[PDB]
């Protein structure tokens, strides 16, 4: 039964505020201390803040103290993180977690670990504006042939925020596809490529099209990827 | 502030084998140590707390030991659902975590197939040139990509991305993207990416000449 469902994430400009919510079900919320823990992209876990079961005592990690506020509403079984004066370094997936209270038949008592976690809410702190990708072919040639196998792809460049999705031939081509994780460029926009390997004998014959979707900007692009003679 | 240091950074094993993971604290944490598992895209899962107590619902193959500054998580027989990142955490003084150990699936060596792609004419007309090098379906993970433009080694103008291990074949793929201004791209002829990997006896270079594609 224990469930923690988070909401409220998204993009927030530096200096602004964003409030996260963690709705609890399936346990007695009002007897448990609650924490927030975050994970920046590609990095490890960092504890952020804790609040006692009754909302009295609250503690914060040094880098957020005086900017973030933790609170709870026991009557609504909800935990909150009010993030103020946000900075790019606050970009992360934020988890709520219940304090792992434990006791045995002999008076042993433990706490201070994280036993059940929310699904995570991504908070992206950026000044970048919503923008769809430009989509460019990665054309096959003999410089992209290893044996009787060729590679081709599409470069999906300069979009914000995540995510984009890429299909090939409207979903008919799935074998051999690799769609790389996005990278954040120095411009503040994301870029990735999607590639596929196919038989070289199919290059003169078969049509290859990548289909790119970026929902935040309502961008939809089909790009035909045609061979070159490198 | 207590610093937890995990080792090794990556462990490469097969199902059935014993996995031993280490966590060392900068000062004593008594027994106030926990271990967590985390898979890509998912929240962490508590495995062990107070150094050696298994959390409810955790299989018996997981065990924790240690006290003071040196701690060990052992998985007596690894199973497929155990390939993941593992973190330690202390609650003796505030709340800190180790940097993680990745437990990855071992397989046989596969050298990367290497492919180079020129910038498209569409992109060039717009002011920028991206050149992409692909290293496909390789294992182990360690690899080096060097870009050369008219034989001059490039530095600082490329970014890499890597997939997770493939679900069927356990290999990685990696892209390296070289970004130049259009004006700079148009000043040079030969664009090359040079790849080394332990499965390759010699480095593999793929190159093209601008304007001959």
């Amino acid at each position: 039964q224990v469930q923690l469902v988070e909401s409220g994430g998204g993009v927030v400009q530096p200096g602004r505020s964003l409030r996260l919510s963690c709705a609890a079900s399936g346990f007695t919320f009002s007897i448990y201390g609650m924490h927030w823990v975050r994970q920046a992209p590609g990095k490890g876990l960092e504890w952020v803040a804790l609040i006692w079961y009754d909302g009295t005592n609250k503690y914060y990690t040094d880098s957020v103290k005086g900017r973030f506020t933790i609170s709870r509403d026991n009557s609504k079984n909800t935990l909150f993180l009010q993030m103020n004066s946000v900075r790019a370094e606050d970009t992360a997936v934020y988890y709520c977690a219940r304090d792992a209270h434990y006791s045995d038949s002999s008076g042993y008592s433990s706490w201070g670990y994280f036993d059940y976690w929310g699904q995570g809410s991504l908070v992206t702190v950026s000044s970048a504006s919503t923008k769809g990708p430009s989509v460019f072919p990665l054309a096959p040639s003999s410089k992209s042939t290893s044996g009787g196998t060729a590679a081709l792809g599409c470069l999906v460049k300069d979009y914000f925020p995540e995510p984009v999705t890429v299909s090939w031939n409207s979903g008919a081509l799935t074998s051999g596809v690799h769609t790389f994780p996005a990278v954040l460029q120095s411009s503040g926009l994301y870029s990735l490529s999607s590639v596929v390997t196919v038989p070289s004998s199919s290059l003169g014959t078969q049509t290859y099209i990548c289909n790119v979707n970026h929902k935040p900007s309502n961008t939809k692009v089909d790009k035909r990827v045609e061979p070159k003679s490198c | 502030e207590i610093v937890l240091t995990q080792s090794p950074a990556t462990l490469s094993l097969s199902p059935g084998e014993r996995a031993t993971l280490s966590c060392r604290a900068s000062q004593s944490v008594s027994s106030y140590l926990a271990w967590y598992q985390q898979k890509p895209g998912q929240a962490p899962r508590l495995l062990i707390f107070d150094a050696s107590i298994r959390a409810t619902g955790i299989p018996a193959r997981f065990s924790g030991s240690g006290s003071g500054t040196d701690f060990t998580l052992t998985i007596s027989s690894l199973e497929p659902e155990d390939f993941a990142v593992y973190y330690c955490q202390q609650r003796s003084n505030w709340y800190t975590f180790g940097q993680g150990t990745k437990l990855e699936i071992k397989r046989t060596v596969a050298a990367p197939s290497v492919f180079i792609f020129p910038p498209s004419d569409e992109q060039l007309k717009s002011g920028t040139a991206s050149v992409v090098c692909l290293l496909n379906n390789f294992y182990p993970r360690e690899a080096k990509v060097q870009w050369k433009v008219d034989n001059a080694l490039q530095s600082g103008n490329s970014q890499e991305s890597v997939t997770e291990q493939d679900s069927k074949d356990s290999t990685y793929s990696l892209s390296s993207t070289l970004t130049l201004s259009k004006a700079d791209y148009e000043k040079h002829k030969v664009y090359a990416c040079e790849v080394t990997h332990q499965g390759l006896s010699s480095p593999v270079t793929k190159s093209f000449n601008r304007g001959e594609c």
């Binding site: 007897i31 201390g33 804790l50 609040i51 006692w52 009754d54 005592n57 706490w111 | 003084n93 505030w94």
Partner: peptide
């Protein structure tokens, strides 16, 4: 005050 005190009901 101790940031590592038990934050749950009934210590």
């Amino acid at each position: 005050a101790n940031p590592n005190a038990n934050p749950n009901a009934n210590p």
